Amino acid sequence: GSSGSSGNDNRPVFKEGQVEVHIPENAPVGTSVIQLHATDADIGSNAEIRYIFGAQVAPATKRLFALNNTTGLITVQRSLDREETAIHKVTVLASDGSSTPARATVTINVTDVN
DSSP states (O other): OOOOOOOOOOOOOOSOSEEEEEEETTOOTTOEEEEOOOOSOSSOOOSOOEEEEOSSOOHHHHHHEEEOTTTOEEEEOSOOOTTTOSEEEEEEEEESSSSSOEEEEEEEEEEOOO
């Protein structure tokens, strides 16, 4: 028409704030635990959303689980241990181009293995 756009701030949104999952410690390497889909305004996607590790995140979790800083997908990276840890609390942060990114909690319950 006549006028186009003015300009404003905009941030993505996670599918679900917190979600509980049940995966066996012996689970096979390469399994997809949880996937966070947070794309900016449908119209126009000229940005790069990176998913980093939240605050107070143990290193072991980073190795045991591989978090893609390009898609934000979490998949089994190495064998896990129940005896040591039973519940895994990992937080993901998506920053496209705003003041502060969005935070998302993810609880992973380790189930025994026959």
